């Protein structure tokens, strides 16, 4: 079991002089990281931040933010990670809903807009203060909520995912049983730390005793220099980052032994060149609810199983279900997951919890299927499913064939009411060059069943997205002009 | 509170990975699961039901590995019996453990146990046809997986109840300590009824790692097996380490870790650190389901003859007269962690005497230096 020694505390005790964090070319050892985090904890403690409270963190990727997360752990305070791209309204909603009483942030955000709800605290000025030394929380309770992270689904109001210390621990372990651990391993994070893809590395770090090379943002050149300067072996990335890394290099940096690719679907041709040029890409499937990846695939299988998300990590389980009955191979249904990395429950979401759980299994809201060998193929969100005359239209499928076209930069497919059929597919595009709708229909013709092809076409400057750049399909109708 | 069966899931993930090398045949994990499922079905035919306790009296064989897993797949507590013990020593443990069955073979005399347990000849058992059964696809973390008896003086042997959870966290903690590599293969010439050997079987299904298995230790045999199968991890006691040093000058380049367990010695370590042998000194016991403290080779000159530091998730402290001991101040070593045993089987007195607030009094003595390294002395 029910408790473990604090990960950072014990890691500092075991290997004090291992590098914990590399940011901006400055280095921080685990002993230093613990000292910093303990110091920040004591400084927070002087602001009436008591054990059992809830603190929200609104920060860009800095070394200070790493301190803040650990400081909350050492104080025994639930850390709420806030997406920095949220509107003032969205931030306030999550602040209130989470029951945060504090907001750790800096001068780059308008802290004054939230004083009326929570006690705001500037990180840089907090560290300039003096404080009475406190005795930290030396033990993490495995079933205690460590961090609260909000879902970014395009359906309904965002839910707070309760991630336990146990969840994070088993995420780190399962991943390591899958990827292996060397003493020379170093992980580069250019993804935000308020997202689970970035946050989880901080826990991998102290549990493995592994150095995290931290970047505030992703630039291909800064990353490539960083990889070579620090002998980076592990890197986490989304599709666009991987695509950009291929444009700027012929060969993959020898130092890199793993590229954990997640967050969504990757186009087959992109993966095919990674195979070609020796990029060790690990396709993965996971969510905030699962504390990161829960299903991963090995470069050995990328061609063989190109479109596949892989198999469950050790200790983890997946199944495909439809109307309560388990699906046959290739039979489409809802992806359900299970394992010690799966969240406790959504915070303060009675309806969502009851509905999303069935006998210890989590309904992910994702549609997909398994092949004969059990490899997972993710399809699309169920909520975004389009029915055209009894037939199922997965927007991600049509968006993919549209995206593959050169003149098409962004594609969005939505279900519009039709008389002849239940709904009809509509394509909302952003374009690099102009494309004739004839050449476009003649492009979808060779790649899609007739009913899948978008009846009409629209053109825009941008597509409706939330703070996670996820496409808001229900808001597509409408923003702008459409030609034929 | 539960994980899918390690062997079953491992077989699902990487079916074709070698699970076992029992020279010189090979068993894939898919094969290991198939063999272990068959033996389970054959045992059920002998009225071996879930919740029962079965004793295993075998020496290092592929069939012994199947037997352990067959118990897990059946939901049967496995008692691993030391073959070097006398007959009355095993009879005591059979009575004590509450075993209903004894799995063994021709090398041991059945009907020298039949008057106390129902005996089954594993080799005979395998030849028999049996109906299919639905295996126990889940391991409960808090349920007793194996029962191993304390082979030590100062009292009648106690049965250590080792949970599936204990074994898992054992395997994980050592991984966090030693690291896992795709090309890793562990060599076990130690007896499988001792936790030093048994734990490797669990590392195998959890890591997805090949175990090269020997019956006994013979230095020439081990070195040939090391190079033929490219062993990278080796478990050994000092007698084995002194032998391998007294045979060849150069350490096989394939080996990356030599996990030394049991007692000390000090002059022998220098002969390894200078000869290129990556020896890892460790402090562990049946109670802690293997090692709980290991010592990295890089800090062996500075740490002299130290046990090392606790594995991740694990804790050690030194106590005397109920109070904590300062650095270098002697006292009893006390361990704590998810790899530490729940309780002795049917030993209420020993349980209360040995456990104080989730801490296990080891019955051993030692201290910690300024840098927190464990230096171990002796038993009471
Ligand atoms: N592989 C794949 N295919 C298709 N759809 C996919 C997908 N992976 C995720 N998804 C969809 O995104 C939803 C989950 O999004 P979030 O809840 O906000 O969190 C994540 O995306 C987890 C990804 C992640 O953690 C990551 C990202 C980048 C590099 C590494 C890692 C990592 O696992 O550590 C979900 O609903 C699903 O439909
Ligand atoms: N190191 C040391 N030192 C001193 N002492 C000791 C040590 N170690 C141990 N020790 C002792 O002994 C005992 C215990 O015993 P048992 O329980 O019976 O068993 C054991 O030991 C275990 C070990 C192991 O496991 C091994 C390994 C691992 O870890 O894995 C490897 C190899 C070998 C072995 C106690 O009591 C103490 O005291
Ligand atoms: Cl809102
Ligand atoms: Cl390591
Ligand atoms: Cl459906
Ligand atoms: Cl252990
Ligand atoms: Mg498992």
From Swiss-Prot, chain B:
**What transmembrane ranges does the database entry give?**
none
Recorded E.C. number(s)?
6.2.1.26
Q: Which UniProt keywords apply?
A: ATP-binding, Ligase, Menaquinone biosynthesis, Nucleotide-binding
Annotated pathway: Quinol/quinone metabolism; 1,4-dihydroxy-2-naphthoate biosynthesis; 1,4-dihydroxy-2-naphthoate from chorismate: step 5/7; Quinol/quinone metabolism; menaquinone biosynthesis
**Which GO terms are recorded in the biological process aspect for this UniProt protein?**
menaquinone biosynthetic process
Is Ribonucleoprotein included in the keywords of this UniProt record? Answer: no
Reactions that this protein is recorded to catalyse: 2-succinylbenzoate + ATP + CoA = 2-succinylbenzoyl-CoA + AMP + diphosphate
Query: What GO MF terms are annotated?
Result: ATP binding; CoA-ligase activity; o-succinylbenzoate-CoA ligase activity
- From what superkingdom does this record's organism come? Bacteria
Per the entry, what this protein does is: Converts 2-succinylbenzoate (OSB) to 2-succinylbenzoyl-CoA (OSB-CoA).
The record's comment on protein family reads: Belongs to the ATP-dependent AMP-binding enzyme family. MenE subfamily.
The protein here is known as 2-succinylbenzoate--CoA ligase
Which portion of the entire protein is included? 3 to 383 of 486
């Amino acid at each position: 079991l029910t408790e473990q020694p604090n990960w950072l505390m014990q890691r500092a005790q075991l290997t004090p002089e291992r590098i914990a964090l590399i940011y901006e070319d400055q280095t921080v050892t685990f002993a230093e990281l613990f000292a910093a985090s303990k110091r920040m904890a004591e400084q927070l403690a002087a602001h009436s931040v008591r054990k059992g409270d809830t603190a929200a963190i609104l920060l860009q990727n800095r070394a200070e933010m790493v301190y803040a997360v650990h400081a909350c752990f050492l104080l025994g305070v639930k850390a709420v990670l806030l997406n920095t791209k949220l509107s003032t309204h969205e931030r306030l909603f999550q602040l209130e809903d989470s029951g945060s009483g504090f907001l750790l942030t800096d001068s780059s955000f308008e802290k004054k807009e939230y004083e009326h709800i929570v006690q705001t605290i500037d990180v840089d000025e907090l560290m300039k203060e003096a404080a009475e030394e406190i005795e930290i929380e030396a033990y993490m309770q495995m079933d205690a909520t460590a961090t609260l992270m909000y879902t970014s689904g395009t359906t309904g109001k965002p839910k707070g995912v309760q991630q336990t210390f146990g969840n994070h621990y088993f995420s780190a372990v399962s991943s390591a049983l899958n990827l292996g651990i060397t003493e020379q391993d170093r992980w580069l994070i250019a993804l935000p730390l308020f997202h689970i893809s970035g946050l989880s590395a901080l826990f991998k770090s102290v549990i493995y005793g592994m150095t995290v090379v931290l970047h505030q943002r992703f630039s291909v050149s800064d990353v490539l220099h960083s990889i070579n300067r620090h002998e980076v072996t592990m890197i986490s990335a989304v599709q666009t980052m991987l695509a950009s890394l291929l444009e700027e290099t012929n060969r993959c940096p020898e130092s890199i032994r793993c590229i954990l690719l997640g967050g969504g679907p990757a186009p087959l041709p992109l993966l095919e060149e990674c195979r070609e040029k020796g990029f060790p890409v690990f396709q993965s499937y996971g969510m905030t609810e699962t504390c990161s990846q829960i299903v991963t695939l090995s470069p050995e299988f990328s061609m063989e199983k190109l479109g596949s998300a892989g198999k469950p990590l050790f200790s983890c389980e997946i199944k495909i279900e439809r109307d309560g009955q388990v699906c046959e191979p290739y039979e489409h249904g809802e992806i359900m997951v299970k394992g010690p990395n799966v969240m406790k429950s959504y915070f303060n979401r009675e309806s969502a919890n009851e509905a999303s759980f069935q006998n210890g299994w989590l309904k992910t809201g994702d549609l997909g299927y398994l092949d004969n060998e059990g490899f997972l193929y993710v399809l699309d969100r169920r909520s975004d499913l389009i029915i055209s005359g009894g037939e199922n239209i997965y927007p991600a499928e049509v968006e993919s064939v549209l995206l593959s076209h050169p003149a098409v930069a962004e594609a969005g497919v939505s279900g519009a009411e039709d008389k002849k059929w239940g709904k009809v597919p509509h394509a909302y595009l952003v374009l690099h060059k102009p494309v004739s709708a004839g050449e476009l229909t003649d492009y979808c013709k060779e790649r899609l069943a007739k009913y899948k092809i978008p009846a009409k076409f629209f053109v825009l400057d941008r597509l409706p997205r939330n703070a996670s750049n996820k496409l808001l399909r229900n808001q597509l109708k409408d923003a702008r002009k459409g030609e034929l």
